[PDB]
Write an enzyme that holds these catalytic residues in place. Structure first.
Site, mmCIF file in Angstrom:
data_model
loop_
_atom_site.group_PDB
_atom_site.id
_atom_site.type_symbol
_atom_site.label_atom_id
_atom_site.label_comp_id
_atom_site.label_asym_id
_atom_site.label_seq_id
_atom_site.Cartn_x
_atom_site.Cartn_y
_atom_site.Cartn_z
ATOM 1 N N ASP A 1 0.809 -1.196 0.000
ATOM 2 C CA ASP A 1 0.000 0.000 0.000
ATOM 3 C C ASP A 1 0.870 1.286 0.000
ATOM 4 O OD1 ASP A 1 -2.519 1.576 0.754
ATOM 5 O OD2 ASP A 1 -1.145 1.926 2.550
ATOM 6 N N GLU B 1 1.473 -0.702 -5.011
ATOM 7 C CA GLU B 1 0.512 0.309 -5.469
ATOM 8 C C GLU B 1 1.195 1.631 -5.711
ATOM 9 O OE1 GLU B 1 -1.350 2.848 -2.983
ATOM 10 O OE2 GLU B 1 -3.158 3.224 -4.118
HETATM 11 C C1 LIG Z 1 -6.162 11.000 8.005
HETATM 12 C C2 LIG Z 1 -7.045 10.860 6.772
HETATM 13 O O1 LIG Z 1 -7.925 9.727 6.902
HETATM 14 C C3 LIG Z 1 -8.727 9.506 5.741
HETATM 15 O O2 LIG Z 1 -7.880 9.186 4.614
HETATM 16 C C4 LIG Z 1 -8.149 7.882 4.054
HETATM 17 C C5 LIG Z 1 -8.332 7.996 2.540
HETATM 18 O O3 LIG Z 1 -9.400 8.863 2.206
HETATM 19 C C6 LIG Z 1 -8.540 6.606 1.907
HETATM 20 O O4 LIG Z 1 -8.495 6.752 0.509
HETATM 21 C C7 LIG Z 1 -7.466 5.584 2.353
HETATM 22 O O5 LIG Z 1 -6.291 5.696 1.709
HETATM 23 C C8 LIG Z 1 -5.540 4.475 1.525
HETATM 24 C C9 LIG Z 1 -4.074 4.787 1.468
HETATM 25 C C10 LIG Z 1 -3.417 5.306 2.719
HETATM 26 O O6 LIG Z 1 -3.364 4.189 3.624
HETATM 27 C C11 LIG Z 1 -3.314 4.617 0.369
HETATM 28 C C12 LIG Z 1 -3.860 4.102 -0.969
HETATM 29 N N1 LIG Z 1 -4.009 4.886 -2.027
HETATM 30 C C13 LIG Z 1 -3.566 6.302 -2.125
HETATM 31 C C14 LIG Z 1 -2.291 6.489 -2.934
HETATM 32 O O7 LIG Z 1 -1.308 5.643 -2.349
HETATM 33 C C15 LIG Z 1 -1.767 7.924 -2.757
HETATM 34 O O8 LIG Z 1 -0.587 8.204 -3.553
HETATM 35 C C16 LIG Z 1 -2.840 8.972 -3.009
HETATM 36 O O9 LIG Z 1 -3.078 9.015 -4.441
HETATM 37 C C17 LIG Z 1 -2.821 10.264 -5.075
HETATM 38 C C18 LIG Z 1 -1.895 10.030 -6.272
HETATM 39 O O10 LIG Z 1 -0.660 9.439 -5.896
HETATM 40 C C19 LIG Z 1 -1.659 11.317 -7.027
HETATM 41 O O11 LIG Z 1 -0.919 11.023 -8.188
HETATM 42 C C20 LIG Z 1 -2.988 11.945 -7.455
HETATM 43 O O12 LIG Z 1 -3.664 11.128 -8.403
HETATM 44 O O13 LIG Z 1 -3.781 12.099 -6.307
HETATM 45 C C21 LIG Z 1 -4.104 10.868 -5.678
HETATM 46 C C22 LIG Z 1 -5.166 11.229 -4.658
HETATM 47 O O14 LIG Z 1 -4.497 11.987 -3.692
HETATM 48 O O15 LIG Z 1 -4.032 8.677 -2.257
HETATM 49 C C23 LIG Z 1 -4.575 7.355 -2.611
HETATM 50 C C24 LIG Z 1 -5.988 7.181 -2.068
HETATM 51 C C25 LIG Z 1 -4.817 3.041 -0.370
HETATM 52 O O16 LIG Z 1 -5.210 2.045 -1.318
HETATM 53 C C26 LIG Z 1 -5.980 3.844 0.187
HETATM 54 O O17 LIG Z 1 -7.168 3.086 0.355
HETATM 55 O O18 LIG Z 1 -7.270 5.652 3.776
HETATM 56 C C27 LIG Z 1 -6.955 6.923 4.298
HETATM 57 C C28 LIG Z 1 -6.553 6.696 5.764
HETATM 58 O O19 LIG Z 1 -7.662 6.308 6.572
HETATM 59 C C29 LIG Z 1 -9.639 10.686 5.415
HETATM 60 O O20 LIG Z 1 -10.274 10.327 4.173
HETATM 61 C C30 LIG Z 1 -8.742 11.921 5.278
HETATM 62 O O21 LIG Z 1 -9.481 13.118 4.995
HETATM 63 C C31 LIG Z 1 -7.893 12.122 6.534
HETATM 64 N N2 LIG Z 1 -7.016 13.262 6.347
HETATM 65 CL CL LIG Z 2 -4.420 -1.507 -5.621
#
Ligand SMILES: C[C@H]1O[C@H](O[C@H]2[C@H](O)[C@@H](O)[C@@H](O[C@@H]3C(CO)=C[C@H](N[C@H]4[C@H](O)[C@@H](O)[C@@H](O[C@H]5[C@H](O)[C@@H](O)[C@@H](O)O[C@@H]5CO)O[C@@H]4C)[C@H](O)[C@H]3O)O[C@@H]2CO)[C@H](O)[C@@H](O)[C@@H]1N
Ligand SMILES: [Cl-]
Ligand SMILES: [Ca+2]
Length: 496
Positions: free
Chosen positions: A197, A233
């Site tokens: 992740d 990922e």
């Molecule tokens: C504290 C925080 O809590 C909550 O956040 C939650 C997210 O909303 C959920 O999506 C979830 O995130 C998971 C995670 C972190 O554990 C990582 C995964 N995916 C990520 C990816 O790794 C990241 O790089 C990023 O993607 C960005 C791209 O890299 C950029 O290129 C561009 O496209 O922007 C995107 C979007 O930013 O974020 C992805 C979602 C994993 O699979 C996810 O499921 O869990 C967190 C933690 O609970 C609340 O939602 C938030 O507001 C709070 N601040």
């Molecule tokens: Cl994935």
């Protein structure tokens, strides 16, 4: 780290998102094994923050509190029982490993966690690990907020807090060792590999240093010298300094361009059409096939998280989704993952789903069991895409055609296409607004074949459409544009 470790002749994994361990173990025995599924991706098995506002969101599982194996999916004993029972029928288990970070910096201190462990994010105290302030990147991050502000700066993407999640100091050997201890515990239980992740938020060299500490796979089920399958990922859609290829030294990488582009084609958006899929793969600018983990949707983008994208197909557009998934499983590019979902109260408010946080089907926070209806679909609001006949039978198509070349391509210049895999399988798609009716070269031996999209072979007969291949390999196909499933697939094991 690139080999799936699946049983010989099983070629796909299914993500049973948020399912309980006892339900997965039964599913291995009653369904996944006799249907030829290679393996299961499970949600994070480690203890997490129990978040009550909003109420038990699916995303609380990406806020670790300790490496104890205690979650809403079940406890350590249930986890071990699942892995054993699955390996014993030739179905592997892959773990979603959350190793970049601990929980949100603004969560209150206390024991609101899935196993009752105390934790204090404010003082950086996680004593069930144990971690302390010394084990986080607070001193290394250089932004004003301490959070990631700018994806154009590769350094802050790695050193600063993703959305306020406490960023582990993966540069130090103590931290690397605590993470490796957790992963080795899983490997010894019988886990066959890991989805890593948030890989973009770690240095490829820090991932390497942790993977160097990992054991070989359990020698009761796996040949001596087996390494865990690793898929990372990384969302790389172009135009930022970090590239999916920076991660190939560690394992496979998720290819997010795959599902975004295929959704656009199948929807016929942006001037795109199915005849352009003749050079699908590296021809579309995707990473090498032997490094790609591919999928139509994942748990983030099916509800507008992650990279989102309006083009993404999901169970909610079932007819186009089955076609996209059907194309992916017939085509030789990449290693394939099928999603398995739950329903939730989707509610839009200025073009966003305000209920995108909702957790799995539950009774006051307690995960509902997966019940099986008499027609083999699932109750309690579980979708069970993996049990849809059109998807299950394509999972078997991919197994039957494994290793066979992409051949015998046909297109009408628009959205009627067909192709073969060696002499073992053939598939035909009608995504145009008129009937497709044509005699085509299949590459298959002469005979009667059951169409595995409309039906099944049982007892020397078919329950659905039958296709008649003549002595020269040709057969007639007729697919109305009004067809509920406008594609046909036949293969060597569907022959009468
Ligand atoms: C504290 C925080 O809590 C909550 O956040 C939650 C997210 O909303 C959920 O999506 C979830 O995130 C998971 C995670 C972190 O554990 C990582 C995964 N995916 C990520 C990816 O790794 C990241 O790089 C990023 O993607 C960005 C791209 O890299 C950029 O290129 C561009 O496209 O922007 C995107 C979007 O930013 O974020 C992805 C979602 C994993 O699979 C996810 O499921 O869990 C967190 C933690 O609970 C609340 O939602 C938030 O507001 C709070 N601040
Ligand atoms: Cl994935
Ligand atoms: Ca980091």
């Amino acid at each position: 780290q690139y080999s799936s470790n699946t049983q010989q002749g099983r070629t796909s994994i299914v993500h049973l998102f948020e399912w309980r361990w006892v339900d997965i173990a039964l599913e291995c025995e009653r369904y996944l094994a006799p249907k030829g599924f290679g393996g299961v991706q499970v949600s994070p098995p480690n203890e997490n923050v129990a978040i009550h506002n909003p109420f038990r969101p699916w995303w609380e599982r990406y806020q670790p509190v300790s490496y104890k194996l205690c979650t809403r999916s079940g406890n350590e004993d249930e986890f071990r029982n699942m892995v054993t029972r699955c390996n014993n029928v030739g179905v592997r288990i892959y773990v979603d490993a959350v190793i970049n970070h601990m929980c949100g910096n603004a969560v209150s201190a206390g024991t609101s966690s899935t196993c009752g462990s105390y934790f204090n994010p404010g003082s950086r105290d996680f004593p069930a690990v144990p971690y302390s302030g010394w084990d986080f990147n607070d001193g290394k991050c250089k932004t004003g907020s301490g959070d990631i502000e700018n994806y154009n700066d590769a350094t802050q993407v790695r050193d600063c807090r993703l959305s306020g999640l406490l960023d582990l100091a993966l540069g130090k050997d103590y931290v690397r060792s605590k993470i490796a201890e957790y992963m080795n515990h899983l490997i010894d239980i019988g886990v066959a590999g890991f989805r890593i992740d948030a890989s973009k938020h770690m240095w490829p060299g820090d991932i390497k240093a942790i993977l160097d500490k990992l054991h070989n796979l359990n020698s009761n089920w796996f040949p001596e010298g087996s390494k865990p399958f690793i898929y990372q990922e990384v969302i790389d859609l172009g135009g930022e300094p970090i590239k999916s290829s920076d991660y190939f030294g560690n394992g496979r990488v998720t290819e997010f361009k795959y599902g975004a582009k295929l959704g656009t084609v199948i929807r016929k958006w942006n001037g795109e059409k199915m005849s352009y899929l003749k050079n699908w793969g590296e021809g579309w600018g995707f990473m090498p096939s032997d490094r790609a983990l591919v999928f139509v949707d994942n748990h983030d983008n099916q509800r507008g998280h992650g990279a989102g994208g309006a083009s993404i197909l999901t169970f909610a557009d079932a007819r186009l989704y089955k076609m996209a998934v059907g194309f992916m499983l017939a085509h030789p590019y990449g290693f394939t993952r099928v999603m398995s979902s739950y329903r939730w109260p989707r509610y839009f408010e200025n073009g966003k789903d305000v209920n995108d946080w909702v957790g799995p089907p539950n009774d006051n926070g307690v995960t509902k069991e997966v019940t099986i209806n008499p027609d083999t679909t699932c109750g309690n609001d579980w979708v069970c895409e993996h049990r849809w006949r059109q998807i299950r039978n394509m999972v078997n198509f991919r197994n039957v055609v494994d290793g066979q070349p992409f051949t015998n391509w046909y297109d009408n210049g628009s959205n009627q296409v067909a192709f073969g895999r060696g002499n073992r399988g053939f598939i035909v798609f009608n995504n145009d607004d008129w009937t497709f009716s044509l005699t085509l070269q299949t590459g298959l031996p002469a005979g009667t074949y059951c169409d595995v999209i409309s039906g099944d072979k049982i007892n020397g007969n078919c329950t659905g459409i039958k296709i008649y291949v003549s002595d020269d390999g040709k057969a007639h196909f007729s697919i109305s544009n009004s067809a509920e499933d406008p594609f046909i697939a036949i293969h060597a094991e569907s022959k009468l």
